[PDB]
Structure 1
Amino acid sequence: PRSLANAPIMILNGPNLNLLGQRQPEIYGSDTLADVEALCVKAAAAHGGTVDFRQSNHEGELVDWIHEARLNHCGIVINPAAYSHTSVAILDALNTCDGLPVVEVHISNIHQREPFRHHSYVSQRADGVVAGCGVQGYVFGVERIAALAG
């Protein structure tokens, strides 16, 4: 249990989010992942914290990063993307550290899409779940982590 002052917020981005801004902008906006990173840095700095923002298309890599967060970070904001719907491994990785504040963010409103996107394994462990609020949802994520680590 590290404070925002003492350790960064881990910001984990799942598969395909590296291409944010290039595709279906009605759904994902025209902002890039670098744009989202800047939003997070800004939100975190208003609370005196920092962020460790990362993206990967590999499930095992995200699990590896979650374990790292357990030791060195004050919380996790995670947009699991497609792995939200299929990754028990990601869920179990978040379950390994009980105390750590976790906020799940979906840029798109998953509940308006295909029936298989309605269920997220991460939601049973996330403290909070933000969906369909665009890239603003990442800001919400940082704010809630700030409130929880506080």
Structure 2
Amino acid sequence: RSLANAPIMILNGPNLNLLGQRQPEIYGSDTLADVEALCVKAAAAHGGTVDFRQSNHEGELVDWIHEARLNHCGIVINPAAYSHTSVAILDALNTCDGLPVVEVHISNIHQREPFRHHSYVSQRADGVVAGCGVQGYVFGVERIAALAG
């Protein structure tokens, strides 16, 4: 499946629904909607499309990964807190044999608490982008573009 043939799946994990609605001062101002638009743009430039979703539920993300698996040209995923706990998410991505996956984190997890330093997703992800702000999602889109074609 190519970029032209199918969309890029963009998945966002728990609490990301509240992006840019917390402390517009300490946290950014961009919202999940601003982020999605960043993706549409980025994908468009390469003649591609995206399919942008967010969920707080472990199992629902598993379901979307299976859908991606059969119907999408790659996955850009920010597992958010499930990055550090979900073997389930990791196993679902392991079934996507041959599919480009890029993992993205808005903040530099490596500067945070020690329990965030490890990500189950990072053993399957082809690339991992961390602490590049919302710009990481564009980087994620571009990397899929390159890999997918």
| Deviation, structure 1 residue 23 | 2.1
| Deviation, structure 1 residue 98 | 1.7
Distance 1:128 1:18 in 2: 24
Cα distance change on mapping 1:100 and 1:82 into 2, 3 Å: same
| Deviation, structure 1 residue 27 | 6.2
| Contact 1:131–1:137 (CA under 8 A) maintained in structure 2 | yes
Structure 2 spans left out of the alignment, 5+ residues = none
Distance 1:26 1:78 in 2: 26
Structure 1 vs Structure 2: percent identity of aligned residues?
A: 100
| Deviation, structure 1 residue 22 | 1.3
Cα distance change on mapping 1:25 and 1:78 into 2, 3 Å: farther
Distance 1:77 1:25 in 2: 25
| Contact 1:27–1:108 (CA under 8 A) maintained in structure 2 | no
| Contact 1:123–1:129 (CA under 8 A) maintained in structure 2 | yes
Q: How many corresponding residue pairs? A: 149
Give per-residue Cα distances to partners, 1:2-58, cap 9 Å, x unaligned. 100000000000000000001255664110000000000000000000000000000
Cα distance change on mapping 1:27 and 1:64 into 2, 3 Å: farther
| Deviation, structure 1 residue 103 | 0.2
> Counterpart in 2 of 1:112?
111
Give per-residue Cα distances to partners, 1:40-80, cap 9 Å, x unaligned. 00000000000000000000000000000001100000000
SS at 2:21 equivalent:
coil
State the TM-score, normalized to the length of structure 1.
Answer: 0.97
Cα distance change on mapping 1:146 and 1:93 into 2, 3 Å: same
Give per-residue Cα distances to partners, 1:102-126, cap 9 Å, x unaligned. 0000001100111101100000000
| Contact 1:28–1:108 (CA under 8 A) maintained in structure 2 | no
User: 4+ runs of 1 displaced by more than 3 Å?
Assistant: 24-28
| Contact 1:10–1:75 (CA under 8 A) maintained in structure 2 | yes
Cα distance change on mapping 1:47 and 1:15 into 2, 3 Å: same
State the TM-score, normalized to the length of structure 2.
Answer: 0.97
Cα RMSD over matched residues?
1.0
Cα distance change on mapping 1:137 and 1:25 into 2, 3 Å: farther
